[PDB]
Design a protein around this ligand. Structure first.
Ligand code: ANP
Ligand code: MG
Ligand code: MG
Length: 346
């Protein structure tokens, strides 16, 4: 008569509620393994992510606690919704795992990057990202860590963002993706809303080029790739850097920079029709306004939404949707356990 059951998925053991049938491993991350499943009660498929011992460290603890609180309060069609939360353990002392249940999407933005997208779908996906990011911004959430792996899509081209971003030692077997972070994060500078526009541009640029824009082993190799293509930023941007960082960037080999038609030629864009020729210029024009190193010269979310390549889908309810305790703090690993439990158990 137990409400839960246990199946072995991959290498781990998933102990889920009886309503969740047939688990198929669909994803895996740093904080948990994601399985797709059927929900008998709701009569639909869902995605179940298992946070194995989230409170084991302050980074993973802060992450888990924050996503849990926001996935409940934030309510937007372009930000993943939480359907059910649960733990198979009965007491705070026995407490080990957390199970996040969300609507099931069909794939990653990484899988969509591997294919040639038409201007209709590319601008719609892009319009959705900016739609959710805008909603997050109105709620006081500035992501700063958007990556394809955390953006999920459905077959009908609907899009949703998975995580809530950045609020940090981690002894782990796995990597962190830096490729989509803004200069005001690579170089530590202090940001504002449009820091997410850079990530959107790194994604669009990859959706077009079909390969990572600014790769690198470290932030040193990555910044190398930023200036090698876009060129050394203007002498007004550098006066905003910290004196120890300013030194490093200023004394770094100079580059004039490539132009956008060179970075993103017409060969990468479908320019057969006359409609596609104009859209291919518009797309390139948006990229040129998103992949700008200086935040003061970088386009805003609102203006990127009013751009001719994106605004063809503008909708008042989707763009200007209404937004909703002060959470950017510090605790020990057992204090976090308590906070996570009392959240999981409303
Ligand atoms: N609701 C969902 N629907 C469909 N697939 C999903 C869903 N949530 C997660 N996945 C997938 O599982 C993968 C990893 O899930 P994720 O939630 O991002 O784990 P994570 O540990 O937080 N990831 P990471 O960014 O590496 O630290 C994603 O790239 C998606 O492919
Ligand atoms: Mg991920
Ligand atoms: Mg994630």
């Amino acid at each position: 008569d137990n409400q839960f059951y246990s199946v072995e998925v991959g290498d781990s053991t998933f102990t889920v509620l009886k309503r969740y049938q047939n688990l198929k491993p669909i994803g895996s991350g740093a904080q948990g393994i994601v399985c797709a499943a059927y929900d008998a009660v709701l009569d639909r498929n869902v995605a179940i992510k298992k946070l194995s011992r989230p409170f084991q460290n302050q980074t993973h603890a802060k992450r888990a606690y924050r996503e849990l609180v926001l996935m409940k309060c934030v309510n937007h069609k372009n930000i993943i919704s939480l359907l059910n939360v649960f733990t198979p353990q009965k007491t705070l002392e026995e407490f080990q795992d957390v199970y996040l249940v969300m609507e099931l999407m069909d794939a990653n933005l990484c899988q969509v990057i591997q294919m040639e997208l038409d201007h209709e779908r590319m601008s719609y996906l892009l319009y959705q990202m900016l739609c959710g990011i805008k909603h997050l911004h109105s709620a006081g959430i500035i992501h700063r860590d958007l990556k394809p792996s955390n953006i999920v899509v459905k077959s009908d081209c609907t899009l949703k963002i998975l995580d809530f971003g950045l609020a940090s030692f981690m002894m782990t077997p796995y990597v962190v993706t830096r490729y989509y972070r803004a200069p005001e994060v690579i170089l530590g500078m202090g940001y504002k809303e449009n820091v997410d526009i850079w990530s959107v541009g790194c994604i669009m640029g990859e959706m077009v080029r079909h390969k990572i824009l600014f790769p690198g082993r470290d932030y040193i190799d990555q910044w190398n790739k930023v200036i090698e293509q876009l060129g050394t930023p203007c002498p007004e941007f550098m006066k905003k850097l910290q004196p120890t960082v300013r030194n490093y960037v200023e004394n770094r080999p100079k580059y004039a920079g490539l132009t956008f038609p060179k970075l993103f030629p017409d060969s990468l864009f479908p320019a057969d029709s006359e409609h596609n020729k104009l859209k291919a210029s518009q797309a390139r024009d948006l990229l040129s306004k998103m992949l700008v190193i200086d935040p003061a010269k970088r386009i805003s979310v609102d203006d990127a939404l009013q751009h001719p390549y994106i605004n063809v889908w503008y909708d008042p309810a989707e763009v200007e949707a209404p937004p909703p305790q002060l959470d950017e703090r510090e605790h020990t690993i057992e204090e976090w356990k308590e906070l996570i439990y009392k959240e999981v158990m409303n």
